[PDB]
From a paper:
Type IIB receptor protein tyrosine phosphatases are cell surface transmembrane proteins that engage in cell adhesion via their extracellular domains (ECDs) and cell signaling via their cytoplasmic phosphatase domains. The four human R2B RPTPs (PTPRK, PTPRM, PTPRT, and PTPRU) are type 1 transmembrane proteins and share a common extracellular domain (ECD) architecture of one MAM (meprin/A5/μ), one immunoglobulin (Ig)-like, and four fibronectin (FN) type-III domains, with the most membrane proximal FN domain undergoing furin cleavage in the secretory pathway. Previous studies have shown that PTPRK, PTPRM, and PTPRT form homodimers, but not heterodimers, in cell aggregation assays. The homophilic (trans) interactions of R2B RPTPs determine their subcellular localization and have been proposed to function as spacer clamps between cell membranes.
Author numbering:
A (entry chain A): 31 to 220, 226 to 388
B (entry chain B): 32 to 221, 226 to 387
Write the structure that this text describes.
């Protein structure tokens, strides 16, 4: 099987597991060939432990697994327990999946409260693959008050069967123009289900379908999206048997284009205007799929709009000594891709003299 | 401006020429020769066609010099069709040839006996520099082989030019194939009105409305346009007082893109497929604004479609020993710009 698991018989370092000294406190290695100081109900062997007695409420210890950069589907099994001699809640065991050494995001699997003196088994299935990479982090958040122990053991990276957790298919990237509604659709083989933003709030389910005996679907709707919503999003589902985690798909938000500069007059007669559009410099996003000129008489009740694919445009059979307003509209792909009218050129034709 | 003619010194002095592939020539009448024509015919110097000397349908063409002007202008001319016995001498056609290209159908014609007096008409052509046009006076002989067609007093005027309507600029139109297209013309003035195809049939009006006290609008619909319809179109309006003619606007028909070849399999496992899209080769028209991969289980209860902007794509957590169909969709701008799905790759995952 792939590397990255650990039994802790030789300690965490032999498994390339590391702890940052700037976290509140360290996970402690429990080992055979060491004096048994723990309560006798606690399991024998070698594993990792956190003791709430030595610490204040909310202090966190984090054990960081080596980076995983695999091509084939795989899963991670681990054992955990939360124990107190008098049944207290020792805290929460959080599991974080950090992608591409970036933001940690919120936990994708957690258990809180007393479980017992026996090991419980859980499975992680993360749809993160080469060339992308991820770290699993085991986070213990302590309740305080000498409330017992949080412990983990027997980490294994497996290629089969990997059937204790649901599996997400590939989540596609989404691109929309600003102000348009966006939707992420997740498909999973195989209780709680949500869409996780890389650095932001978690989005609740809008819709769910059971599309097959083996496969179901869930939809997440983001309304009137804004350039600040541009981030990576991934689906997460959790059960007591384990969690499934999808790939971080990207939301791209595009701004409909409009020109920076107004049109300019290149030439004019009594009945014609020759105009330079100046539409090459814009605010917003390309590609420009349609460039339109609208022109109006300043007294006019109506406006004439033409598609133009040239730097210059010419208008004719105009009235002499008449003042016109000319604007350019720019269009990019998709709904809402037509921008706001550009800044106007206001000029007039020559007179009858 | 120059380009008119009184015909006092003849057609050659005005740079008026006749087409060598014409059936016969216009004849110059001069005051300098004895008036051999019927005395009812007007005196002076002008151009004439005698239907008696010719067979039915023989055509004579007198071609004016090229006009490449800026600013509104118009062409006035005098005409008559005369017979001693009131017979129909034929048809006087006026053709406006743009950019030395195809002549297209007449934009003004009169047929039948008019009388012995000159009648006056005006042309307004919205073709301007850098584009150019020729006016052609065409005489088609009636086949009753009797009477005369005559023209006189050609004048190019910049003002007032108020006997014929003037079209504003007609914009080019671009649509994807199978979509409906519309040309809209705006004209000044108060009649017969149509959209003229340069090398093709003339299209009748779909709708007409009043947008202003001085200007009116007309709309022409072409349904389910096809690459055969890609041509230049111009608006023409005609009255007994004259004609107005717009610029030759272009209809562009685009083909929605689709790939030539199906996707190919680069790699496969029990639960994944790695696919090469092969979408760089297409039959439609660019630009490609959206490239999509769709994949489905052959049981086809559901279909998954992803936007992909890379030569290769990977699908994962598929079921082992199950068959998948994968297609690539390409999209270009505008309504109907989504092409038909590409050729499918049909393959299955391994079994382990
Ligand atoms: C066990 O795991 C679950 C799943 O991760 C976890 O639930 C999540 O908890 C976090 C908090 O740790 C939630 O995130 C917050 O949600 C509230 C609304 O309920 C927001 O007000 C918060 O906003 C903060 O962050 C913003 C970042 O942009 C700031 O702008 C803002 O000002 C706030 O600082 C924050 O988004 C998250 O929504 C839930 N998700 C779910 C699905 O429940 C749970 O907490 C874990 N349990 C333990 C004990 O750790
Ligand atoms: C006077 O001018 C008008 C306008 O140009 C002429 O009408 C046009 O005549 C042509 C034929 O010369 C028509 O084209 C034909 O259309 C039919 C279908 O209608 C098609 O079957 C033929 O193959 C050909 O394409 C054209 O449609 C028609 N346009 C209009 C608006 O009527 C008219 O013929 C001229 N009269 C004379 C005596 O020259
Ligand atoms: C994951 O795959 C990448 C890409 O390699 C391709 O997939 C492999 C399964 C195999 O079929 C290769 O022939 C393919 O080209 C691996 O990246 C390559 O790794 C090899 C060996 O270390 C190296 O020589 C190449 O330079 C790497 N890059 C490329 C573009 O081939 C990667 O190592 C694989 N990782 C795991 C954990 O399997
Ligand atoms: C119509 O206007 C254009 C723009 O001025 C004219 O084009 C120029 O004409 C002059 C001669 O008058 C040349 O020296 C220039 O080389 C032409 N090009 C440009 C870009 O200036 C055109 O001649 C005008 N024609 C009429 C009949 O008015
Ligand atoms: C988004 O969806 C809501 C649903 O009520 C709708 O009112 C709104 O107009 C939608 N906006 C866009 C841009 O589609
Ligand atoms: C085109 O117009 C016809 C009516 O002439 C209509 O039936 C058809 O649906 C239209 N097609 C499109 C694509 O608008
Ligand atoms: Na162990
Ligand atoms: Na004369």
């Amino acid at each position: 099987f792939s590397a990255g698991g650990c039994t802790f018989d030789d300690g965490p370092g032999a498994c390339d597991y590391h702890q940052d000294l700037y976290d509140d406190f360290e996970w402690v290695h429990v080992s055979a060939q060491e004096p048994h100081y723990l309560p006798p109900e606690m399991p024998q062997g070698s594993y990792m432990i956190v003791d709430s007695s030595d610490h204040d409420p909310g202090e966190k210890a984090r054990l960081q697994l080596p980076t995983m950069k695999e091509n084939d589907t795989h899963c991670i099994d681990f054992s955990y327990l939360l124990y107190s001699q008098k049944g207290l809640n020792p805290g929460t065991l959080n599991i974080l999946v950090r992608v591409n050494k970036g933001p940690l995001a919120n936990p994708i699997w957690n258990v809180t409260g007393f479980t017992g003196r026996d090991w419980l088994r859980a499975e992680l299935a993360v749809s993160t693959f080469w060339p992308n990479e991820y770290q699993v982090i085991f986070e213990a958040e302590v309740s305080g008050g000498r409330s017992g122990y949080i412990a983990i053991d027997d980490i294994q990276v497996l290629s089969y069967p990997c059937d204790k957790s649901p599996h997400f298919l590939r989540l596609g990237d989404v691109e929309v123009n600003a102000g348009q509604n966006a939707t992420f659709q997740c498909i999973a083989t195989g209780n709680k289900l949500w869409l996780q933003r890389r650095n932001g709030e978690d989005i609740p389910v809008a819709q769910t379908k059971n599309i097959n005996h083996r496969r179901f679907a869930a939809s997440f709707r983001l309304q009137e999206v804004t350039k600040t919503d541009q981030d990576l999003y991934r689906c997460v589902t959790q059960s007591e048997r384990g969690s499934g985690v999808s790939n971080f798909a990207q939301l791209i938000v595009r701004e409909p284009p409009r020109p920076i500069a107004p049109p300019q007059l290149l030439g004019v007669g009594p009945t014609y205007l020759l105009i330079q559009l100046n539409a090459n410099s814009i605010i917003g996003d390309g590609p420009i799929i349609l460039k339109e000129v609208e022109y109006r008489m300043t007294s006019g009740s109506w406006t004439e709009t033409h598609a133009v694919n040239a730097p210059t445009y010419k208008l004719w059979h105009l009235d002499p000594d008449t003042e016109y307003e000319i604007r350019v509209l720019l269009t990019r792909p998709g709904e809402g891709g037509t921008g706001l009218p550009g800044p106007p050129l206001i000029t007039r034709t020559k007179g009858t003299k």
